[PDB]
Amino acid sequence: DDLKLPRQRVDLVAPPFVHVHEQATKQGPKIMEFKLVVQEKKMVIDEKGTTFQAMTFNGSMPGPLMVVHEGDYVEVTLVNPATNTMPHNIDFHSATGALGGGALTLINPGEQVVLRWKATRTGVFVYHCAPGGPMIPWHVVSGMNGAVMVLPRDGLNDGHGHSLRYDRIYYIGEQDLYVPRDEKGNFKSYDSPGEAYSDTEEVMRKLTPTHVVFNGKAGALTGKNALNANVGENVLIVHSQANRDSRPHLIGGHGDYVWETGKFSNAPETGLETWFIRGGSAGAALYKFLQPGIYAYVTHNLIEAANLGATAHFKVEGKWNDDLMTQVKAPADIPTGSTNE
Amino acid sequence: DDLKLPRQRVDLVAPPFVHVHEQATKQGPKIMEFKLVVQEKKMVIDEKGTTFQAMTFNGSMPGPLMVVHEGDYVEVTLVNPATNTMPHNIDFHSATGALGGGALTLINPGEQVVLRWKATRTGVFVYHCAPGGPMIPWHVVSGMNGAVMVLPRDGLNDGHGHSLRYDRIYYIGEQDLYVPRDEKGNFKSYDSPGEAYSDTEEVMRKLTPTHVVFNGKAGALTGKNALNANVGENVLIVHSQANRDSRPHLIGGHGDYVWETGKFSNAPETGLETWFIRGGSAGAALYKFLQPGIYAYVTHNLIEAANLGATAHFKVEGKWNDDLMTQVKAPADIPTGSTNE
Amino acid sequence: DDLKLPRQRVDLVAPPFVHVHEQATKQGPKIMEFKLVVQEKKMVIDEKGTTFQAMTFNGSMPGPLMVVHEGDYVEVTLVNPATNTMPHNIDFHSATGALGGGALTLINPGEQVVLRWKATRTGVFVYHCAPGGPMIPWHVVSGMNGAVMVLPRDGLNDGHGHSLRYDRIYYIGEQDLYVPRDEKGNFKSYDSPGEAYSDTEEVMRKLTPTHVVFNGKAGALTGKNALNANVGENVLIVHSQANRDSRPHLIGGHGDYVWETGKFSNAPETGLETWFIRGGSAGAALYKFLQPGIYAYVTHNLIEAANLGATAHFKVEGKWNDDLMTQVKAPADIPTGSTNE
Ligand SMILES: OC[C@H]1O[C@@](CO)(O[C@H]2O[C@H](CO)[C@@H](O)[C@H](O)[C@H]2O)[C@@H](O)[C@@H]1O
Ligand SMILES: OC[C@H]1O[C@@](CO)(O[C@H]2O[C@H](CO)[C@@H](O)[C@H](O)[C@H]2O)[C@@H](O)[C@@H]1O
Ligand SMILES: OC[C@H]1O[C@@](CO)(O[C@H]2O[C@H](CO)[C@@H](O)[C@H](O)[C@H]2O)[C@@H](O)[C@@H]1O
Ligand SMILES: OC[C@H]1O[C@@](CO)(O[C@H]2O[C@H](CO)[C@@H](O)[C@H](O)[C@H]2O)[C@@H](O)[C@@H]1O
Ligand SMILES: OC[C@H]1O[C@@](CO)(O[C@H]2O[C@H](CO)[C@@H](O)[C@H](O)[C@H]2O)[C@@H](O)[C@@H]1O
Ligand SMILES: OC[C@H]1O[C@@](CO)(O[C@H]2O[C@H](CO)[C@@H](O)[C@H](O)[C@H]2O)[C@@H](O)[C@@H]1O
Ligand SMILES: O=N[O-]
Ligand SMILES: O=N[O-]
Ligand SMILES: O=N[O-]
Ligand SMILES: O=N[O-]
Ligand SMILES: O=N[O-]
Ligand SMILES: O=N[O-]
Ligand SMILES: O=N[O-]
Ligand SMILES: O=N[O-]
Ligand SMILES: O=N[O-]
Ligand SMILES: [Cu+2]
Ligand SMILES: [Cu+2]
Ligand SMILES: [Cu+2]
Ligand SMILES: [Cu+2]
Ligand SMILES: [Cu+2]
Ligand SMILES: [Cu+2]
Structure with missing residues (x-):
């Protein structure tokens, strides 16, 4: 001992x-x-x-x-x-x-x-x-x-002598998958990992995934498995990608403090729209929610996000701030006296 | 109100x-x-x-x-x-x-x-x-x-208390396109966006663009539509990519001050050769031209730049500085007494 | 003159x-x-x-x-x-x-x-x-x-007024290659660069390399051509990629000081797991070896590293530090009284 x-x-x-x-x-x-x-x-x-x-x-x-x-x-x-x-x-x-x-x-x-x-x-x-x-x-x-x-040991800081504290933490693991297809384009099924290997290795060699998923499946963190938060909460989102680059984006939000290389000895960047997780790394983003409603958390290759499975949802409870954003005029017929060239 | x-x-x-x-x-x-x-x-x-x-x-x-x-x-x-x-x-x-x-x-x-x-x-x-x-x-x-x-409200700064001012500003929007091909490899034409959709979605799924263009077409910012500048001018180049990563490079120049994540609350990096715009973001680069002539602005995947359309030109007016660069000896026959192994 | x-x-x-x-x-x-x-x-x-x-x-x-x-x-x-x-x-x-x-x-x-x-x-x-x-x-x-x-002229510094000195320097050039295949999938051979061009350009257009190599071939910096270092040595690794992004990672180590955009006017980042070389750039990483043995230096797209050729080896001489890492119990049969659900 x-x-x-x-x-x-x-x-x-x-x-x-x-x-x-x-x-x-x-x-x-x-x-x-x-x-x-x-x-x-x-x-x-x-x-x-x-x-x-x-x-x-x-x-x-x-x-x-x-x-x-x-x-x-x-x-x-x-x-x-x-x-x-x-x-x-x-x-x-x-x-x-x-x-x-x-x-x-x-x-x-x-x-x-x-x-x-x-x-x-x-x-x-x-x-x-x-x-x-x-x-x-x-x-x-x-x-x-x-x-x-x-x-x-003192927890997170903003790299300029101020402590940062999260109210909530989520871990989003992003996975690139390489599922073999038959001649007609349907996904093939196998009875063991070993039986899948040879066909899978051929898909891997072309460096284009068939699926890109958060938490192991398309839609895993949508619907009833949406992530919960409240207006005012500082939420830490840890994002990892072991094999392939990712570009996380919180739709309708920002990264208030982002460690995109994921190492707390470096001061975070502030107010990011989209950040970059290099394949073989984890990063972290802190955001304080300012508006209630649905937020989509995506990789901002939108083909991967919408068509290959890489979309998560936050459902945020609270009161809407019309100062930050408002619908001034609801959808309405284009006025007759309008010129739109 | x-x-x-x-x-x-x-x-x-x-x-x-x-x-x-x-x-x-x-x-x-x-x-x-x-x-x-x-x-x-x-x-x-x-x-x-x-x-x-x-x-x-x-x-x-x-x-x-x-x-x-x-x-x-x-x-x-x-x-x-x-x-x-x-x-x-x-x-x-x-x-x-x-x-x-x-x-x-x-x-x-x-x-x-x-x-x-x-x-x-x-x-x-x-x-x-x-x-x-x-x-x-x-x-x-x-x-x-x-x-x-x-x-x-105070305009740009270098993140160390000095104001930065541009003489000129250009917006370079980079677009990845997915144009369907027929069995012989020719690009297909359609009479509406809706008719194009199903074939286009199949190209999108393989995550390889057919074209990568600045300002909407191959060659848009070359020839007579080259971007103008002068020796001594500080030029701000705003670069956006809504869907796919880009790696901008000014051939024969540098990024004097670069916000590659595009957010002015962060101090710019200095003296970059090539910078990185993550898909779903905009960045900005300031350069002060030091030499006249033609500059190519590219994404430094040179296959995309030369073969898929992602090249723009600057034509810069001014006087050549032989201290920064000079042709000491013009192309000439290799001397007979040379050994070149 | x-x-x-x-x-x-x-x-x-x-x-x-x-x-x-x-x-x-x-x-x-x-x-x-x-x-x-x-x-x-x-x-x-x-x-x-x-x-x-x-x-x-x-x-x-x-x-x-x-x-x-x-x-x-x-x-x-x-x-x-x-x-x-x-x-x-x-x-x-x-x-x-x-x-x-x-x-x-x-x-x-x-x-x-x-x-x-x-x-x-x-x-x-x-x-x-x-x-x-x-x-x-x-x-x-x-x-x-x-x-x-x-x-x-004063050599490297940590961007906070302390000099950095390397004991050893290696240059790792990463090359993406586009080798044409015949209908059966075998690589084609040509008698001149000109004869290879037309088939090679078709592979280049699909933006997926057939090989990704360090120092010009798969396995170039493994076996007898492994890179040498000693425990305690500060090693500078210069990494370049002229055409395509790379994500270098020293397996079992870190980047103590990393210039991922490769420009010494910018303070390095500290303690990186994986860093990012944008296509058309060079970067540099300083690491002080703390443990002896074999280290793999890879691009952390592990498909490219293991299957397309992008793996180098360091062989590091010295004494093992059991405080940093130790095998507490060697592989052994799962105990009979274990529950593992
Ligand atoms: O993708 C090729 C081709 O295959 C089809 C079935 O013949 O659909 C398969 O691939 C789709 C996209 O990955 C999946 O949505 C589906 O699960 C799978 O059968 C065609 O629809 C498609 O063009
Ligand atoms: O720097 C982190 C910081 O961003 C904050 C400012 O304190 O908010 C950003 O958006 C807010 C919108 O109302 C503004 O207060 C501020 O101007 C802007 O930078 C916080 O949410 C957080 O501390
Ligand atoms: O790219 C496949 C194949 O198609 C051909 C025409 O049969 O050329 C097409 O694709 C080229 C590359 O995108 C374009 O230059 C051209 O506009 C288009 O017809 C072949 O040349 C090529 O091998
Ligand atoms: O830091 C921005 C700065 O780069 C400058 C130096 O003031 O120039 C770079 O290239 C010049 C070439 O003559 C040199 O003055 C300087 O040594 C180098 O860093 C400016 O163009 C700009 O302010
Ligand atoms: O990659 C397609 C197909 O080609 C074969 C030969 O018919 O192997 C070739 O490609 C392999 C992967 O690049 C190489 O290992 C090999 O050198 C080359 O002949 C098949 O094995 C493969 O499925
Ligand atoms: O900041 C660079 C620095 O990392 C060092 C600390 O001086 O080591 C890292 O790993 C070591 C493992 O024993 C620790 O000393 C230290 O806590 C950690 O950051 C050096 O190797 C180097 O100067
Ligand atoms: O020792 N107190 O946490
Ligand atoms: O241990 N690998 O299959
Ligand atoms: O949560 N993944 O299986
Ligand atoms: O109020 N003057 O710009
Ligand atoms: O509104 N979309 O086709
Ligand atoms: O400038 N684009 O159509
Ligand atoms: O001038 N001495 O190196
Ligand atoms: O000079 N180019 O083939
Ligand atoms: O070291 N390359 O040929
Ligand atoms: Cu395993
Ligand atoms: Cu790893
Ligand atoms: Cu629309
Ligand atoms: Cu968006
Ligand atoms: Cu040449
Ligand atoms: Cu170049």
Whole structure:
């Protein structure tokens, strides 16, 4: 027991929600204990019921958000149950050495491993499976990726000596999928990940996804699963993309404070319309809602947003501010005395 | 008449030019009144005369640049003449609430609507049509997008307490187009936007444009329509892309001061070779010309620039500075006594 | 002899190595003399032995890194031997005027030209061939691109008044290639660049590369050609992409200080997981190695990294730090008393 710090078990929750945590803390460094269980399973990924052979951490795309503070030690039990067919591992972009932990965590079905890494760098970071060679992109685009957030011990700041505090936090994991089609253009179904591999690799090689989804399926965060907020609330939106660039945009809002490279040692940019998550990274945006109603959160490639599945909804409760925006005149017939050339 | 401010009618001009405005102002907030008229029409988009079914604000791709100051109110009359076939609306990324105004501006052919928004955020911002669902990307990539610039009341600054002033301003709207081809690879023609839709949506789904153009067509800002400047002039180039990333580059120049995320609350970067406009955003670059001659302004995917139409020209008048650059020896035969391995 | 400064001949070396230079200097401005010789040749670009008709500066993809200091004059002899078949030229993104020098350097086979430019802007910059029209993207994606680094005379700093010094420097040139295939999907071979052109242009038009390589071929910087470093060394990695965006990531490390737009007048960002090189630019990242072992340097589109060739290796010598990372429990059978749902 060389490392004599208090230990604290964390129970992960399914995205887009985030386990209980403190923003600012005066506790010393702890050993934060997390468990991730690999689950290979068929999942539905679009509103027409298209299925595909997914591989996940904890049964979700993305994998759950892990939240720790700078100077904590993160002790991760990775479990690969004997119902799975492939070896798996985990690479933390937040960690230093051994390919992020990938070189120390390769496990066959029936095995588990315990990795500890010190959280020396603040920000939001991708974690993903990375077995070796062509298996790396295949496991990642099959759904084996998540994020970890390392907060400063004093919580967030605006980079100019003022504290920032969120009222609410959501984790939006964006996934690019490569689903094979038959000669007529219909999506193909398979009975195992292994059977899907050869056809999937051919789609992957052309670098155009068939689907781009938040929280694992088209429409996952719309309708009854819309994200909730209130006028006046400061909401932190963590966005990750393990493989492909994304350009997040809150329709009818802004990013008040945006870390687009996702690292809290850098001052955020202010008042962004659209921001940029580079493939293999996580970013974060803080917005204070000023108007009630429906907001669409999209990647602002609008083809991907509207036609390939990458749209989420916020439903915001509160009172409308007619000073910020108003309909002066409702739709009406163009006046007869109008000239419109 | 709850809002008791002076009103000022603005006459928009066709890009790449920009309506008359002040950089710094000591006038108080005004209500700035703008009119936009939707026009569906067939347009030529390449040097071989390829046509396509365009939908525009004010008959231009992009739509015109609107210029206001922080704290102004922007009162927009959107008109959809009864010669058009579809409903249209407008979403301002500069505005707060109701999906940027899209939720308050949906109009059938024969109708108009008046929206007012307060310009609370500085920078350059995209505006675009967004009717609903798959119609959103289709109207945007059919040409229904423009930009608005909200200046600080004191005009631009370098983020370190020094004022920046432009001698000239150009608005470069970049458009990704998806023109269907027949089995032999020739571009198809249609008699209406509706007839084009199904074939166009199939091209859009593969996320590779057939054309990438500035000011609505290949070669629009070359030859006689080259942009003019003089040695010593500080030129502001506003660049927008409503749907797809762009990487602007002034060949033979630099970006002296670049807001690549396009928001004037952030200090510009200095001395850039190439900058990055994320899809769904506008950016701005200031350059002071130091040499006369021809400059190519490109997206630095050179395939898109040279082969898909995304090249503009500046013709700069003045005297050559042999200290910055000189041809020491004109092309000449390789000397006989040379070794070149 | 209007310009009366000392002259210094520089001998270029093949990437990923960099010719001898000083970081900080108290010497005055010099005329730094460089020679580049164009070589058209067939080259192997993947581990299955696929060939393609390359065009290079000095026989390498990328062309060699040129290192000068702010205020130096750069005098470049470009040579196009009569064994070549096409005209060539050179465009320096670091230079001011005449399309970066392209308008002053067009040479037929059998000819040479001498261009001088003043290094007024600090950073790393792309140089590339740019003959005219569709020849521009074709020569660049055929391999005619490199980089130049203009150091501040005081060397690098962290943008907050502290000097940064590298122990080692590597230049990673990333190349997107467009190799035509036959009806069965096999790569086609040609006897000249001219014969390859028409088929290559068709692949280029679809904006999806067949290969994405560092230092001119898949696996070039793996195995015995891995890059060397030691625990504690500050390593500068210069990354260029003349045509297409890249998202560099050091697997198991970070970017301690990153200039992603590549310009030393801007303070670097700190502690990045993944950074972004916009097509037509060079960037630079400083990392201090903290752990020994193998590191993969990738573009974090993992399909491109693992399947299209864009992976390099660092082999780092030193002692493992179990405080930063440790395997707490080696792979072992899942305990019988475990529940993993
Ligand atoms: O800011 C650059 C800086 O990062 C350093 C801190 O000096 O290290 C990072 O990772 C180290 C891991 O032990 C920690 O010292 C530090 O907490 C963290 O930011 C250096 O390698 C470098 O100067
Ligand atoms: O996309 C090609 C072609 O395939 C069809 C079916 O023959 O539709 C498939 O692809 C659509 C777009 O991805 C999906 O909406 C659908 O689930 C799938 O069957 C054609 O409609 C289409 O042109
Ligand atoms: O800088 C973050 C900041 O943006 C704020 C200003 O405090 O609001 C922006 O939009 C508001 C709209 O009413 C204005 O107060 C302000 O002018 C504008 O920059 C906050 O929501 C937040 O602190
Ligand atoms: O692009 C496929 C194929 O189509 C042809 C005509 O059969 O040319 C078409 O596409 C070209 C590239 O977009 C255009 O230059 C031209 O306007 C259009 O007819 C072939 O030339 C080409 O290989
Ligand atoms: O920082 C903006 C600044 O760039 C300037 C310097 O004032 O010029 C750049 O290129 C010039 C070439 O002669 C040099 O004066 C200078 O060294 C370099 O940074 C201006 O054009 C502008 O203010
Ligand atoms: O990629 C299409 C198709 O072509 C084949 C050969 O018929 O393989 C070629 O393409 C592969 C991927 O680029 C290369 O690995 C190989 O060098 C080349 O022959 C098929 O394997 C493939 O499905
Ligand atoms: O030690 N108090 O949180
Ligand atoms: O399966 N994803 O939330
Ligand atoms: O471990 N990969 O299939
Ligand atoms: O009030 N003067 O501009
Ligand atoms: O039609 N565009 O300028
Ligand atoms: O309103 N859309 O076609
Ligand atoms: O002048 N001394 O380096
Ligand atoms: O040929 N490239 O190093
Ligand atoms: O000079 N171009 O082939
Ligand atoms: Cu896996
Ligand atoms: Cu990774
Ligand atoms: Cu419309
Ligand atoms: Cu939008
Ligand atoms: Cu050339
Ligand atoms: Cu260039």
